[PDB]
Specification:
The structure is a homodimer of 306-residue chains. Chain A is α+β, with helices and mostly antiparallel strands and 306 residues long. In chain A, 23% of the residues lie in helices and 26% in strands. At the A-B interface, helix 1, strand 9, strand 10 and helix 8 of A face helix 1, strand 9, strand 10 and helix 8 of B. Chains A, B: There is a cross-link at residues 5, 90 (Glycyl lysine isopeptide (Lys-Gly) (interchain with G-Cter in ubiquitin)).
Protein backbone atom coordinates (compact mmCIF):
# COMPACT_ATOMS: atom_id res chain seq x y z
CA UNK A 1 0.00 0.00 0.00
CA UNK A 2 1.01 3.69 0.33
CA UNK A 3 0.46 6.65 -2.00
CA UNK A 4 3.05 8.99 -3.59
CA UNK A 5 3.17 11.54 -6.40
CA UNK A 6 4.84 9.25 -8.93
CA UNK A 7 6.54 10.23 -12.19
CA UNK A 8 6.96 7.95 -15.20
CA UNK A 9 10.36 6.29 -15.60
CA UNK A 10 12.35 8.69 -17.73
CA UNK A 11 14.82 6.36 -19.48
CA UNK A 12 13.15 6.58 -22.90
CA UNK A 13 13.05 10.35 -22.65
CA UNK A 14 16.66 10.79 -21.48
CA UNK A 15 17.87 9.18 -24.71
CA UNK A 16 16.27 12.04 -26.68
CA UNK A 17 17.59 15.06 -24.79
CA UNK A 18 20.14 17.11 -26.72
CA UNK A 19 21.82 20.48 -26.30
CA UNK A 20 20.89 23.13 -28.88
CA UNK A 21 22.96 26.29 -29.21
CA UNK A 22 22.28 29.24 -31.49
CA UNK A 23 24.47 32.29 -31.17
CA UNK A 24 24.89 32.82 -27.44
CA UNK A 25 21.79 30.95 -26.22
CA UNK A 26 21.84 27.28 -25.15
CA UNK A 27 18.79 25.28 -24.11
CA UNK A 28 17.47 21.73 -24.55
CA UNK A 29 16.05 20.01 -27.62
CA UNK A 30 14.22 16.77 -28.33
CA UNK A 31 15.81 14.38 -30.85
CA UNK A 32 13.34 11.97 -32.51
CA UNK A 33 14.19 10.18 -35.78
CA UNK A 34 16.27 12.81 -37.66
CA UNK A 35 14.59 15.95 -36.29
CA UNK A 36 15.46 18.03 -33.22
CA UNK A 37 12.62 20.02 -31.61
CA UNK A 38 13.41 23.03 -29.46
CA UNK A 39 11.81 26.37 -28.55
CA UNK A 40 12.19 28.95 -31.28
CA UNK A 41 13.33 31.63 -28.82
CA UNK A 42 16.76 29.96 -28.97
CA UNK A 43 17.37 32.30 -31.91
CA UNK A 44 16.88 35.33 -29.64
CA UNK A 45 19.10 37.45 -27.41
CA UNK A 46 18.04 39.00 -24.10
CA UNK A 47 16.98 42.18 -25.90
CA UNK A 48 15.30 40.38 -28.81
CA UNK A 49 12.91 38.85 -26.28
CA UNK A 50 11.08 42.12 -25.54
CA UNK A 51 9.48 42.03 -28.99
CA UNK A 52 10.85 39.40 -31.39
CA UNK A 53 9.95 39.26 -35.05
CA UNK A 54 10.71 35.56 -35.24
CA UNK A 55 10.51 35.28 -39.03
CA UNK A 56 13.13 37.99 -39.55
CA UNK A 57 15.32 36.62 -36.77
CA UNK A 58 15.30 33.13 -38.34
CA UNK A 59 16.02 34.39 -41.87
CA UNK A 60 19.43 35.66 -40.75
CA UNK A 61 20.23 32.09 -39.59
CA UNK A 62 21.60 29.25 -41.77
CA UNK A 63 21.73 25.49 -41.08
CA UNK A 64 25.36 25.63 -39.81
CA UNK A 65 24.43 28.44 -37.33
CA UNK A 66 22.89 25.73 -35.08
CA UNK A 67 25.16 23.72 -32.72
CA UNK A 68 23.34 20.51 -31.79
CA UNK A 69 25.21 18.24 -29.37
CA UNK A 70 23.80 14.92 -28.19
CA UNK A 71 26.08 13.98 -25.36
CA UNK A 72 29.46 14.04 -27.08
CA UNK A 73 28.18 13.32 -30.62
CA UNK A 74 27.93 16.32 -32.90
CA UNK A 75 24.81 16.30 -35.04
CA UNK A 76 24.88 17.84 -38.52
CA UNK A 77 22.02 20.23 -39.36
CA UNK A 78 20.79 19.89 -42.96
CA UNK A 79 17.51 21.84 -42.59
CA UNK A 80 15.79 24.27 -40.22
CA UNK A 81 12.15 25.23 -40.00
CA UNK A 82 9.70 27.10 -37.77
CA UNK A 83 6.41 25.45 -36.83
CA UNK A 84 4.37 27.80 -34.65
CA UNK A 85 6.63 28.46 -31.66
CA UNK A 86 8.94 25.41 -32.14
CA UNK A 87 12.01 25.07 -34.30
CA UNK A 88 12.44 21.86 -36.28
CA UNK A 89 16.17 21.29 -36.95
CA UNK A 90 16.58 18.58 -39.60
CA UNK A 91 19.75 16.61 -38.89
CA UNK A 92 21.61 14.07 -41.00
CA UNK A 93 21.37 11.04 -38.65
CA UNK A 94 18.35 9.53 -36.92
CA UNK A 95 18.45 9.10 -33.14
CA UNK A 96 19.03 5.34 -32.64
CA UNK A 97 17.49 5.73 -29.17
CA UNK A 98 14.21 7.02 -30.61
CA UNK A 99 11.35 5.45 -28.63
CA UNK A 100 7.97 4.67 -30.01
CA UNK A 101 6.25 8.01 -29.55
CA UNK A 102 3.42 10.29 -30.49
CA UNK A 103 2.76 14.00 -30.04
CA UNK A 104 -0.36 14.75 -27.99
CA UNK A 105 -2.12 17.92 -26.92
CA UNK A 106 -3.48 17.28 -23.42
CA UNK A 107 -6.50 18.78 -21.76
CA UNK A 108 -6.44 21.07 -18.73
CA UNK A 109 -6.65 18.88 -15.67
CA UNK A 110 -4.55 16.05 -17.10
CA UNK A 111 -1.14 15.12 -15.67
CA UNK A 112 2.31 14.36 -17.05
CA UNK A 113 5.94 13.85 -15.99
CA UNK A 114 8.58 16.53 -16.63
CA UNK A 115 12.24 15.70 -17.26
CA UNK A 116 13.98 18.94 -16.26
CA UNK A 117 17.19 19.42 -18.24
CA UNK A 118 20.08 21.88 -18.40
CA UNK A 119 22.43 21.97 -21.40
CA UNK A 120 20.88 18.75 -22.67
CA UNK A 121 21.55 16.74 -19.51
CA UNK A 122 18.70 15.35 -17.36
CA UNK A 123 18.71 16.48 -13.75
CA UNK A 124 15.33 15.45 -12.36
CA UNK A 125 11.87 14.11 -12.99
CA UNK A 126 8.63 15.07 -11.27
CA UNK A 127 4.89 14.79 -11.83
CA UNK A 128 2.64 17.76 -12.47
CA UNK A 129 -0.69 18.90 -13.82
CA UNK A 130 -1.75 21.24 -16.60
CA UNK A 131 -3.75 23.75 -14.58
CA UNK A 132 -7.28 24.74 -15.63
CA UNK A 133 -5.77 28.09 -16.70
CA UNK A 134 -3.23 26.22 -18.91
CA UNK A 135 -0.22 26.94 -16.67
CA UNK A 136 1.98 24.52 -14.80
CA UNK A 137 3.56 24.97 -11.38
CA UNK A 138 6.97 23.44 -12.06
CA UNK A 139 10.70 23.76 -11.27
CA UNK A 140 12.52 25.44 -14.20
CA UNK A 141 15.70 27.51 -13.78
CA UNK A 142 17.69 29.43 -16.36
CA UNK A 143 18.46 27.11 -19.25
CA UNK A 144 15.73 24.57 -18.50
CA UNK A 145 13.89 25.72 -21.65
CA UNK A 146 13.12 22.92 -24.09
CA UNK A 147 12.58 20.38 -21.31
CA UNK A 148 9.56 18.29 -22.19
CA UNK A 149 6.69 16.62 -20.38
CA UNK A 150 5.26 13.25 -21.33
CA UNK A 151 3.17 10.26 -20.41
CA UNK A 152 4.05 6.61 -21.08
CA UNK A 153 1.24 4.38 -22.39
CA UNK A 154 2.62 0.84 -22.25
CA UNK A 155 5.57 1.22 -24.63
CA UNK A 156 4.64 4.54 -26.28
CA UNK A 157 6.05 7.85 -25.05
CA UNK A 158 3.37 10.52 -25.47
CA UNK A 159 5.03 13.92 -25.59
CA UNK A 160 2.59 16.64 -24.59
CA UNK A 161 4.58 19.61 -23.25
CA UNK A 162 7.62 21.69 -24.13
CA UNK A 163 8.71 24.37 -21.70
CA UNK A 164 9.25 27.92 -22.98
CA UNK A 165 8.99 30.55 -20.28
CA UNK A 166 8.41 31.67 -16.74
CA UNK A 167 5.65 34.22 -16.34
CA UNK A 168 6.33 37.27 -14.14
CA UNK A 169 4.03 35.64 -11.56
CA UNK A 170 6.46 32.67 -11.34
CA UNK A 171 4.29 30.01 -12.98
CA UNK A 172 5.32 28.26 -16.17
CA UNK A 173 3.98 28.13 -19.69
CA UNK A 174 4.89 26.19 -22.78
CA UNK A 175 3.67 24.52 -25.94
CA UNK A 176 2.71 21.15 -27.27
CA UNK A 177 5.29 19.52 -29.54
CA UNK A 178 3.66 21.18 -32.57
CA UNK A 179 4.48 24.57 -31.06
CA UNK A 180 1.01 25.75 -30.05
CA UNK A 181 1.08 27.25 -26.56
CA UNK A 182 -1.23 25.98 -23.95
CA UNK A 183 -3.35 28.97 -23.05
CA UNK A 184 -3.13 32.58 -24.21
CA UNK A 185 0.61 32.95 -23.78
CA UNK A 186 3.13 34.15 -26.35
CA UNK A 187 6.91 33.74 -26.48
CA UNK A 188 7.63 37.39 -25.77
CA UNK A 189 9.00 39.07 -22.61
CA UNK A 190 5.90 40.99 -21.44
CA UNK A 191 3.42 40.74 -18.58
CA UNK A 192 0.91 38.02 -19.39
CA UNK A 193 -2.29 37.28 -17.53
CA UNK A 194 -3.01 33.71 -16.61
CA UNK A 195 -6.68 33.16 -15.93
CA UNK A 196 -8.22 32.73 -12.54
CA UNK A 197 -7.05 29.26 -11.60
CA UNK A 198 -9.51 26.72 -10.24
CA UNK A 199 -9.14 23.38 -8.46
CA UNK A 200 -9.66 20.26 -10.58
CA UNK A 201 -12.69 18.79 -8.79
CA UNK A 202 -12.59 15.40 -10.53
CA UNK A 203 -8.95 14.91 -9.47
CA UNK A 204 -9.71 15.83 -5.82
CA UNK A 205 -12.42 13.20 -5.73
CA UNK A 206 -10.10 10.60 -7.28
CA UNK A 207 -7.60 11.35 -4.50
CA UNK A 208 -10.29 10.95 -1.83
CA UNK A 209 -10.88 7.47 -3.29
CA UNK A 210 -7.13 6.82 -3.01
CA UNK A 211 -7.48 7.83 0.63
CA UNK A 212 -10.21 5.31 1.35
CA UNK A 213 -8.31 2.51 -0.42
CA UNK A 214 -5.41 3.28 1.95
CA UNK A 215 -7.33 3.43 5.23
CA UNK A 216 -8.61 7.04 5.77
CA UNK A 217 -12.33 7.02 6.66
CA UNK A 218 -12.72 10.14 8.60
CA UNK A 219 -14.10 12.48 5.94
CA UNK A 220 -16.80 9.96 5.00
CA UNK A 221 -20.16 11.41 6.03
CA UNK A 222 -23.76 10.32 6.59
CA UNK A 223 -24.98 12.71 3.91
CA UNK A 224 -25.25 12.60 0.17
CA UNK A 225 -25.96 15.37 -2.33
CA UNK A 226 -27.01 16.01 -5.89
CA UNK A 227 -24.89 16.82 -8.93
CA UNK A 228 -26.60 20.22 -9.41
CA UNK A 229 -26.30 21.18 -5.73
CA UNK A 230 -22.68 20.12 -5.39
CA UNK A 231 -21.67 22.42 -8.25
CA UNK A 232 -23.26 25.30 -6.34
CA UNK A 233 -20.71 24.67 -3.60
CA UNK A 234 -18.03 24.08 -6.23
CA UNK A 235 -18.53 27.55 -7.73
CA UNK A 236 -18.25 29.15 -4.28
CA UNK A 237 -14.86 27.51 -3.57
CA UNK A 238 -13.48 27.79 -7.14
CA UNK A 239 -13.64 24.10 -7.94
CA UNK A 240 -14.25 23.08 -11.52
CA UNK A 241 -17.90 22.13 -12.07
CA UNK A 242 -18.51 18.39 -12.12
CA UNK A 243 -20.06 16.83 -15.23
CA UNK A 244 -21.53 13.38 -15.82
CA UNK A 245 -18.44 12.61 -17.89
CA UNK A 246 -16.48 13.08 -14.65
CA UNK A 247 -18.84 10.83 -12.67
CA UNK A 248 -18.43 8.13 -15.31
CA UNK A 249 -14.62 8.48 -15.06
CA UNK A 250 -14.91 7.73 -11.35
CA UNK A 251 -16.89 4.52 -11.94
CA UNK A 252 -14.09 2.02 -11.21
CA UNK A 253 -13.00 3.82 -8.05
CA UNK A 254 -16.67 3.90 -7.03
CA UNK A 255 -16.94 0.15 -7.56
CA UNK A 256 -13.77 -0.80 -5.66
CA UNK A 257 -14.56 1.25 -2.56
CA UNK A 258 -18.35 0.79 -2.59
CA UNK A 259 -18.78 4.58 -2.19
CA UNK A 260 -21.17 6.23 -4.65
CA UNK A 261 -19.72 9.30 -6.38
CA UNK A 262 -22.39 11.64 -5.03
CA UNK A 263 -21.69 10.28 -1.54
CA UNK A 264 -18.04 11.22 -2.05
CA UNK A 265 -19.22 14.60 -3.41
CA UNK A 266 -21.14 15.16 -0.17
CA UNK A 267 -18.01 14.34 1.85
CA UNK A 268 -16.02 16.80 -0.27
CA UNK A 269 -18.76 19.42 0.12
CA UNK A 270 -18.45 19.28 3.91
CA UNK A 271 -14.66 19.50 3.58
CA UNK A 272 -14.91 22.71 1.54
CA UNK A 273 -17.48 24.25 3.87
CA UNK A 274 -15.84 23.31 7.20
CA UNK A 275 -12.22 22.71 6.28
CA UNK A 276 -10.09 19.86 7.54
CA UNK A 277 -9.92 20.98 11.20
CA UNK A 278 -6.16 20.51 11.23
CA UNK A 279 -6.35 16.80 10.43
CA UNK A 280 -4.87 15.27 7.31
CA UNK A 281 -5.78 13.01 4.37
CA UNK A 282 -3.06 10.71 2.99
CA UNK A 283 -0.62 12.87 4.94
CA UNK A 284 -1.74 16.16 3.38
CA UNK A 285 -3.30 19.16 5.14
CA UNK A 286 -4.82 20.39 1.85
CA UNK A 287 -7.02 18.86 -0.78
CA UNK A 288 -4.81 17.42 -3.52
CA UNK A 289 -5.82 17.85 -7.15
CA UNK A 290 -2.77 16.61 -9.08
CA UNK A 291 -3.88 12.95 -9.42
CA UNK A 292 -6.18 12.06 -12.28
CA UNK A 293 -8.56 9.12 -11.81
CA UNK A 294 -6.21 7.16 -14.10
CA UNK A 295 -3.24 8.03 -11.87
CA UNK A 296 -5.13 6.61 -8.92
CA UNK A 297 -6.09 3.34 -10.63
CA UNK A 298 -2.49 2.91 -11.84
CA UNK A 299 -0.97 3.31 -8.39
CA UNK A 300 -3.60 1.05 -6.80
CA UNK A 301 -3.29 -1.77 -9.38
CA UNK A 302 0.46 -1.55 -10.28
CA UNK A 303 0.41 -0.82 -14.04
CA UNK A 304 3.87 -1.33 -15.60
CA UNK A 305 5.34 -0.22 -18.93
CA UNK A 306 8.63 -2.02 -19.79
CA UNK B 1 12.23 29.26 -10.44
CA UNK B 2 9.78 26.93 -8.64
CA UNK B 3 10.35 23.99 -6.26
CA UNK B 4 9.22 20.35 -6.62
CA UNK B 5 9.84 17.00 -4.96
CA UNK B 6 12.16 15.85 -7.71
CA UNK B 7 13.53 12.35 -8.35
CA UNK B 8 16.78 11.44 -10.11
CA UNK B 9 16.51 10.47 -13.80
CA UNK B 10 15.91 6.75 -13.75
CA UNK B 11 17.35 5.61 -17.09
CA UNK B 12 20.53 3.96 -15.79
CA UNK B 13 18.57 2.06 -13.17
CA UNK B 14 15.79 0.87 -15.50
CA UNK B 15 18.38 -1.05 -17.51
CA UNK B 16 19.19 -3.17 -14.45
CA UNK B 17 15.68 -4.25 -13.37
CA UNK B 18 14.79 -7.89 -14.00
CA UNK B 19 11.97 -10.20 -12.95
CA UNK B 20 12.74 -12.99 -10.47
CA UNK B 21 10.23 -15.77 -9.85
CA UNK B 22 10.37 -18.68 -7.43
CA UNK B 23 7.37 -20.93 -6.92
CA UNK B 24 4.35 -18.66 -6.79
CA UNK B 25 6.26 -15.51 -5.86
CA UNK B 26 7.37 -12.95 -8.45
CA UNK B 27 9.28 -9.82 -7.42
CA UNK B 28 12.05 -7.59 -8.80
CA UNK B 29 15.79 -8.04 -9.06
CA UNK B 30 18.79 -5.85 -9.78
CA UNK B 31 21.06 -7.15 -12.58
CA UNK B 32 24.55 -5.68 -12.25
CA UNK B 33 27.47 -7.35 -14.07
CA UNK B 34 26.56 -11.07 -13.95
CA UNK B 35 24.72 -11.05 -10.58
CA UNK B 36 21.04 -10.53 -9.87
CA UNK B 37 20.28 -9.16 -6.39
CA UNK B 38 16.79 -9.65 -4.99
CA UNK B 39 15.20 -10.21 -1.59
CA UNK B 40 15.98 -13.64 -0.24
CA UNK B 41 12.31 -14.03 0.78
CA UNK B 42 11.47 -14.87 -2.84
CA UNK B 43 12.30 -18.45 -1.86
CA UNK B 44 9.49 -18.51 0.71
CA UNK B 45 5.84 -19.45 0.48
CA UNK B 46 3.09 -17.55 2.32
CA UNK B 47 3.35 -20.04 5.20
CA UNK B 48 7.17 -20.20 5.17
CA UNK B 49 7.15 -16.44 5.88
CA UNK B 50 5.84 -16.91 9.44
CA UNK B 51 9.22 -18.26 10.55
CA UNK B 52 11.64 -18.98 7.72
CA UNK B 53 14.80 -20.97 8.23
CA UNK B 54 16.46 -19.38 5.24
CA UNK B 55 19.54 -21.61 5.28
CA UNK B 56 17.47 -24.82 5.05
CA UNK B 57 15.03 -23.26 2.57
CA UNK B 58 17.85 -22.18 0.23
CA UNK B 59 19.54 -25.58 0.50
CA UNK B 60 16.42 -27.23 -0.95
CA UNK B 61 16.34 -24.81 -3.92
CA UNK B 62 18.04 -25.48 -7.25
CA UNK B 63 19.27 -23.07 -9.94
CA UNK B 64 16.36 -23.99 -12.21
CA UNK B 65 14.00 -23.00 -9.39
CA UNK B 66 14.89 -19.35 -10.25
CA UNK B 67 13.26 -17.92 -13.37
CA UNK B 68 15.02 -14.63 -14.18
CA UNK B 69 13.27 -12.58 -16.86
CA UNK B 70 14.90 -9.52 -18.46
CA UNK B 71 12.42 -8.09 -20.92
CA UNK B 72 11.85 -10.88 -23.45
CA UNK B 73 15.06 -12.84 -22.78
CA UNK B 74 15.15 -15.30 -19.93
CA UNK B 75 18.52 -15.39 -18.20
CA UNK B 76 20.18 -18.62 -17.12
CA UNK B 77 20.96 -18.88 -13.41
CA UNK B 78 24.24 -20.70 -12.78
CA UNK B 79 24.47 -20.00 -9.06
CA UNK B 80 22.58 -18.87 -5.95
CA UNK B 81 23.87 -17.64 -2.59
CA UNK B 82 22.76 -15.60 0.42
CA UNK B 83 24.44 -12.43 1.68
CA UNK B 84 22.58 -11.44 4.85
CA UNK B 85 18.99 -10.91 3.64
CA UNK B 86 19.68 -10.60 -0.13
CA UNK B 87 19.96 -13.46 -2.59
CA UNK B 88 22.76 -13.34 -5.19
CA UNK B 89 21.75 -15.16 -8.40
CA UNK B 90 24.82 -15.61 -10.61
CA UNK B 91 23.69 -15.61 -14.24
CA UNK B 92 25.19 -16.69 -17.52
CA UNK B 93 25.51 -13.24 -19.15
CA UNK B 94 26.74 -9.90 -17.84
CA UNK B 95 24.27 -7.00 -18.13
CA UNK B 96 25.50 -4.92 -21.10
CA UNK B 97 23.65 -1.94 -19.61
CA UNK B 98 25.53 -2.05 -16.25
CA UNK B 99 26.20 1.54 -15.14
CA UNK B 100 29.08 2.71 -13.07
CA UNK B 101 27.74 1.98 -9.61
CA UNK B 102 28.48 1.59 -5.94
CA UNK B 103 26.68 0.04 -3.00
CA UNK B 104 26.03 2.59 -0.25
CA UNK B 105 24.46 2.50 3.20
CA UNK B 106 22.74 5.81 3.93
CA UNK B 107 21.97 7.60 7.17
CA UNK B 108 18.50 8.30 8.54
CA UNK B 109 17.38 11.65 7.20
CA UNK B 110 19.05 11.32 3.81
CA UNK B 111 16.88 11.10 0.71
CA UNK B 112 16.91 8.88 -2.33
CA UNK B 113 14.94 8.03 -5.46
CA UNK B 114 12.80 4.85 -5.72
CA UNK B 115 12.13 3.06 -8.99
CA UNK B 116 8.88 1.27 -8.15
CA UNK B 117 8.67 -1.91 -10.21
CA UNK B 118 6.31 -4.86 -10.83
CA UNK B 119 7.34 -8.13 -12.57
CA UNK B 120 10.65 -6.48 -13.46
CA UNK B 121 9.05 -3.56 -15.30
CA UNK B 122 9.62 0.04 -14.19
CA UNK B 123 6.32 1.69 -13.45
CA UNK B 124 7.17 4.91 -11.59
CA UNK B 125 9.80 6.97 -9.80
CA UNK B 126 9.58 9.15 -6.70
CA UNK B 127 11.78 10.85 -4.15
CA UNK B 128 11.72 9.72 -0.56
CA UNK B 129 13.41 10.01 2.79
CA UNK B 130 14.78 7.38 5.10
CA UNK B 131 12.88 8.25 8.28
CA UNK B 132 14.76 8.67 11.59
CA UNK B 133 13.12 5.39 12.65
CA UNK B 134 14.63 3.68 9.54
CA UNK B 135 11.33 3.18 7.69
CA UNK B 136 10.18 4.79 4.50
CA UNK B 137 6.71 6.06 3.65
CA UNK B 138 6.59 4.77 0.12
CA UNK B 139 4.13 3.38 -2.45
CA UNK B 140 4.60 -0.40 -2.68
CA UNK B 141 1.91 -2.90 -3.78
CA UNK B 142 2.11 -6.68 -4.14
CA UNK B 143 5.15 -7.73 -6.17
CA UNK B 144 6.99 -4.43 -5.77
CA UNK B 145 9.51 -6.21 -3.51
CA UNK B 146 13.07 -5.88 -4.77
CA UNK B 147 12.50 -2.33 -6.07
CA UNK B 148 15.59 -0.29 -5.29
CA UNK B 149 16.42 3.21 -4.13
CA UNK B 150 19.42 5.18 -5.33
CA UNK B 151 21.22 8.48 -5.78
CA UNK B 152 23.35 9.64 -8.74
CA UNK B 153 26.69 11.33 -7.90
CA UNK B 154 27.90 12.85 -11.17
CA UNK B 155 28.08 9.63 -13.26
CA UNK B 156 27.94 6.84 -10.64
CA UNK B 157 24.71 5.20 -9.47
CA UNK B 158 24.73 4.81 -5.67
CA UNK B 159 22.32 2.06 -4.70
CA UNK B 160 21.24 2.51 -1.11
CA UNK B 161 17.92 0.70 -0.68
CA UNK B 162 16.19 -2.57 -1.58
CA UNK B 163 12.53 -2.96 -0.61
CA UNK B 164 11.59 -6.11 1.32
CA UNK B 165 8.38 -5.68 3.29
CA UNK B 166 5.39 -3.67 4.33
CA UNK B 167 4.96 -3.57 8.07
CA UNK B 168 1.52 -4.35 9.49
CA UNK B 169 1.26 -0.60 10.26
CA UNK B 170 1.59 0.22 6.51
CA UNK B 171 5.12 1.69 6.46
CA UNK B 172 7.92 0.04 4.48
CA UNK B 173 11.25 -1.53 5.36
CA UNK B 174 14.19 -2.88 3.43
CA UNK B 175 17.92 -3.43 3.26
CA UNK B 176 21.04 -1.94 1.81
CA UNK B 177 22.41 -3.78 -1.19
CA UNK B 178 24.49 -5.96 1.14
CA UNK B 179 21.28 -7.33 2.64
CA UNK B 180 21.47 -5.56 6.01
CA UNK B 181 18.08 -4.12 6.98
CA UNK B 182 17.77 -0.54 7.92
CA UNK B 183 16.38 -0.46 11.45
CA UNK B 184 15.45 -3.32 13.76
CA UNK B 185 13.39 -5.20 11.15
CA UNK B 186 13.68 -8.84 10.00
CA UNK B 187 12.35 -10.61 6.91
CA UNK B 188 9.67 -12.63 8.62
CA UNK B 189 5.92 -12.06 8.74
CA UNK B 190 5.41 -11.06 12.37
CA UNK B 191 4.41 -7.87 14.14
CA UNK B 192 7.44 -5.59 14.18
CA UNK B 193 7.71 -2.40 16.21
CA UNK B 194 9.09 0.59 14.34
CA UNK B 195 10.51 3.33 16.51
CA UNK B 196 8.90 6.58 17.46
CA UNK B 197 9.37 8.65 14.34
CA UNK B 198 10.61 12.23 14.50
CA UNK B 199 10.66 15.08 12.00
CA UNK B 200 14.04 15.77 10.37
CA UNK B 201 14.77 19.26 11.67
CA UNK B 202 17.73 19.98 9.39
CA UNK B 203 15.61 19.11 6.34
CA UNK B 204 12.78 21.46 7.38
CA UNK B 205 15.23 24.34 7.66
CA UNK B 206 16.62 23.53 4.22
CA UNK B 207 13.09 23.74 2.82
CA UNK B 208 12.40 27.04 4.60
CA UNK B 209 15.53 28.34 2.88
CA UNK B 210 14.21 26.91 -0.40
CA UNK B 211 11.05 28.89 0.40
CA UNK B 212 12.91 32.18 0.80
CA UNK B 213 14.89 31.62 -2.41
CA UNK B 214 11.57 31.25 -4.24
CA UNK B 215 9.77 34.23 -2.70
CA UNK B 216 7.98 32.89 0.41
CA UNK B 217 9.28 34.86 3.39
CA UNK B 218 6.16 35.65 5.47
CA UNK B 219 7.46 33.30 8.18
CA UNK B 220 10.72 35.25 8.60
CA UNK B 221 10.64 36.76 12.07
CA UNK B 222 12.62 39.32 13.52
CA UNK B 223 14.23 37.28 16.41
CA UNK B 224 16.99 34.77 17.03
CA UNK B 225 17.53 31.88 19.44
CA UNK B 226 20.35 29.66 20.63
CA UNK B 227 21.07 26.10 19.64
CA UNK B 228 20.29 24.88 23.18
CA UNK B 229 17.07 26.88 23.45
CA UNK B 230 15.85 25.74 20.04
CA UNK B 231 16.34 22.03 20.73
CA UNK B 232 14.24 22.41 23.88
CA UNK B 233 11.35 23.53 21.67
CA UNK B 234 12.16 20.89 19.04
CA UNK B 235 11.95 18.00 21.53
CA UNK B 236 8.47 19.16 22.61
CA UNK B 237 7.25 18.85 18.98
CA UNK B 238 9.11 15.62 18.13
CA UNK B 239 11.72 17.28 15.97
CA UNK B 240 15.18 15.82 15.73
CA UNK B 241 17.69 17.81 17.84
CA UNK B 242 19.78 20.20 15.75
CA UNK B 243 23.58 19.80 16.05
CA UNK B 244 26.40 22.09 14.92
CA UNK B 245 27.05 19.58 12.15
CA UNK B 246 23.56 20.47 10.95
CA UNK B 247 24.18 24.21 11.26
CA UNK B 248 27.43 23.83 9.31
CA UNK B 249 25.63 21.83 6.61
CA UNK B 250 23.17 24.72 6.16
CA UNK B 251 26.04 27.15 5.65
CA UNK B 252 25.72 27.65 1.90
CA UNK B 253 21.98 28.29 2.03
CA UNK B 254 22.69 30.72 4.87
CA UNK B 255 25.20 32.66 2.77
CA UNK B 256 23.05 32.77 -0.38
CA UNK B 257 19.95 34.08 1.44
CA UNK B 258 21.55 36.29 4.08
CA UNK B 259 19.62 34.57 6.89
CA UNK B 260 21.78 33.12 9.65
CA UNK B 261 20.96 29.53 10.59
CA UNK B 262 19.95 30.51 14.12
CA UNK B 263 17.60 33.22 12.82
CA UNK B 264 15.92 30.58 10.67
CA UNK B 265 15.56 28.34 13.73
CA UNK B 266 13.79 31.28 15.41
CA UNK B 267 11.38 31.42 12.48
CA UNK B 268 10.85 27.67 12.79
CA UNK B 269 10.43 27.88 16.58
CA UNK B 270 7.57 30.34 16.05
CA UNK B 271 6.14 28.16 13.28
CA UNK B 272 6.00 25.17 15.63
CA UNK B 273 4.38 27.07 18.51
CA UNK B 274 1.67 28.92 16.56
CA UNK B 275 1.21 26.84 13.43
CA UNK B 276 0.76 28.26 9.95
CA UNK B 277 -2.59 30.00 10.48
CA UNK B 278 -3.84 28.83 7.10
CA UNK B 279 -0.93 30.21 5.10
CA UNK B 280 1.19 27.96 2.95
CA UNK B 281 4.90 27.65 2.37
CA UNK B 282 5.88 26.64 -1.18
CA UNK B 283 2.27 25.50 -1.66
CA UNK B 284 2.22 23.29 1.42
CA UNK B 285 0.12 23.54 4.60
CA UNK B 286 2.56 21.38 6.58
CA UNK B 287 6.25 21.67 7.29
CA UNK B 288 8.20 19.56 4.80
CA UNK B 289 11.13 17.43 5.99
CA UNK B 290 11.89 15.35 2.87
CA UNK B 291 14.46 17.74 1.34
CA UNK B 292 18.06 17.62 2.56
CA UNK B 293 20.21 20.74 2.25
CA UNK B 294 21.94 19.06 -0.69
CA UNK B 295 18.57 18.47 -2.37
CA UNK B 296 17.81 22.20 -2.06
CA UNK B 297 21.16 23.27 -3.57
CA UNK B 298 20.78 20.80 -6.48
CA UNK B 299 17.38 22.13 -7.50
CA UNK B 300 18.39 25.79 -7.01
CA UNK B 301 21.64 25.65 -9.03
CA UNK B 302 20.52 23.10 -11.66
CA UNK B 303 23.11 20.35 -11.25
CA UNK B 304 22.82 17.75 -14.05
CA UNK B 305 24.02 14.13 -14.46
CA UNK B 306 22.88 12.92 -17.92
Amino acid sequence: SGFRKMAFPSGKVEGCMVQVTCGTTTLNGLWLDDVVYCPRHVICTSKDMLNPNYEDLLIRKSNHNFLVQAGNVQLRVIGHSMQNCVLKLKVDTANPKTPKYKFVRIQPGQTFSVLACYNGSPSGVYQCAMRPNFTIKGSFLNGSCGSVGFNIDYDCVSFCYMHHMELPTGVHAGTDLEGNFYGPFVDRQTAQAAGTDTTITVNVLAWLYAAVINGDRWFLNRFTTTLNDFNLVAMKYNYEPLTQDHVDILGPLSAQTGIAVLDMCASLKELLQNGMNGRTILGSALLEDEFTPFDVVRQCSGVTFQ
